């Protein structure tokens, strides 16, 4: 197996029988949710373990496969992840940002939240926050200023959730990366309206990609936060 760097720092391609999207495991030997681990050799040769990132199982991976130009998630970045669920996608964001970054992982539901806490115990760059993202004042003591807000919330009022969290925690010129599942909010009309709500919260849309063929009627949107207002 040969490892090739992806365009996006902290993301890689494992070239073998199949070409797979992978991240470098921050907790070697540990799989988070049954994903395959691949060890690559490179005095005994040194081994580096990567984890397969399946775009059918992660909205962010699906976006990366579609060719997002700007990810805003990279080594050393601080990322506020809304909708962290049991931590599957968050584990890969943790791999990407590495030891110099941080993932603030917000999830409201306790069944997945308990699994999020458990997996975070093995990754010191994850801060698990079991709270309602509609009320970011409640966890402001737990979060600094972040470089990116990622949201996979699938709520009808997710636009307000994203806005409130961005105004509290997102650096000026920081990024917003949002998955929009039209059904949980025609699709093209919904997408346009949600993107407009972002504009009304000082977020300038940069790119909008479908998640086909990985997902139906989903759209990932990347934007830039303009604290002083759209120019």
């Amino acid at each position: 197996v040969v490892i090739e760097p992806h365009r996006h720092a902290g993301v890689y391609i494992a070239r073998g029988k199949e070409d797979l999207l992978v991240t470098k495991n921050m907790a070697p030997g540990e799989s988070v949710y049954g994903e395959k681990r691949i060890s690559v050799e490179e005095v005994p040769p040194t081994k580096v373990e990567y984890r397969v990132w399946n775009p059918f199982r992660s909205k962010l991976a699906a976006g990366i496969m579609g060719g997002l130009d700007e990810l805003f998630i990279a080594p050393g970045k601080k990322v506020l992840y809304l909708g962290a669920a049991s931590g599957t996608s968050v584990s890969h964001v943790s791999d990407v940002v590495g030891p110099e970054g941080v993932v603030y992982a917000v999830e409201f539901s306790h069944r997945p939240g308990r699994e999020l806490i458990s997996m975070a115990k093995k990754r010191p760059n994850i801060i698990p926050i079991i709270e309602d993202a509609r009320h970011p004042q409640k966890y402001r003591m737990l979060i600094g200023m972040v470089d990116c807000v990622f949201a996979d919330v699938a709520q009808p009022d997710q636009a307000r959730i994203i806005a409130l969290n961005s105004h509290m925690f997102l650096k000026d010129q920081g990024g917003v990366v949002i998955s929009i599942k039209a059904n949980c909010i025609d699709a093209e009309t919904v997408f346009a309206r949600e993107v407009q709500k972002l504009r009304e919260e000082r977020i300038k849309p940069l790119e909008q990609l479908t998640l086909e063929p990985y997902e139906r009627d989903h759209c990932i949107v990347v934007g830039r936060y303009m604290r002083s207002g759209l120019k």
Binding site: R114, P128, Q137, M141, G144, R227, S228
Partner: protein
């Protein structure tokens, strides 16, 4: 009453409470908000706008978690009462009220109940100044990269474990 300038600012660190004095001159601040917002992003320029009065560290992890819980619910702990009691000037016959920037409007009524002469402010300028403290972090405090983040890690686990009954 009418819009009064922000005089002080409260910031809740994972490690303790901080009271800052707001030095920004706020004549017609609306016409200058964009320029102020740009100053806040640069540490050097931000030092013109605010200055630390007091940082009061929590005694340990148990008190930090008690305060994370109180703050999450808009409550004034004994530690928050103390730092406000000791570091906000007291009302006098020559200066009747004091304005305090806070980010959580729901904490305001709890503060005023303990300090009726304090008017809490949570408008856009207050939020911008609080973002600035959040942004520049340890550089504002005598006694490092990671200190606050390390404290957030332990406090976030503690907060979340208490919620899910771990």
């Amino acid at each position: 009453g009418a819009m009064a300038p922000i005089e002080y600012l409260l910031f809740e660190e994972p490690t303790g409470y901080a009271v800052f004095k707001v030095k920004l001159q706020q004549d017609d601040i609306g016409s200058r908000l964009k320029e102020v917002q740009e100053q806040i992003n640069d540490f050097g320029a931000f030092t013109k706008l605010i200055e630390l009065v007091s940082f009061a560290p929590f005694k340990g992890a148990a008190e930090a978690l008690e305060n994370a819980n109180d703050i999450s619910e808009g409550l004034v702990s004994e530690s928050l009462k103390a730092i406000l009691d000791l570091n906000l000037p007291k009302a006098s016959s020559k200066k009747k009220n004091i304005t305090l920037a806070i980010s959580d409007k729901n904490l305001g009524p709890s503060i005023k109940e303990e300090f009726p002469y304090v008017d809490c402010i949570s408008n856009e300028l207050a939020q911008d100044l609080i973002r600035g403290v959040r942004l520049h972090g340890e550089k504002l405090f005598k006694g490092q990269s990671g200190d606050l983040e390390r404290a957030q890690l332990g406090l976030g686990h503690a907060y979340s474990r208490a919620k899910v009954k771990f």
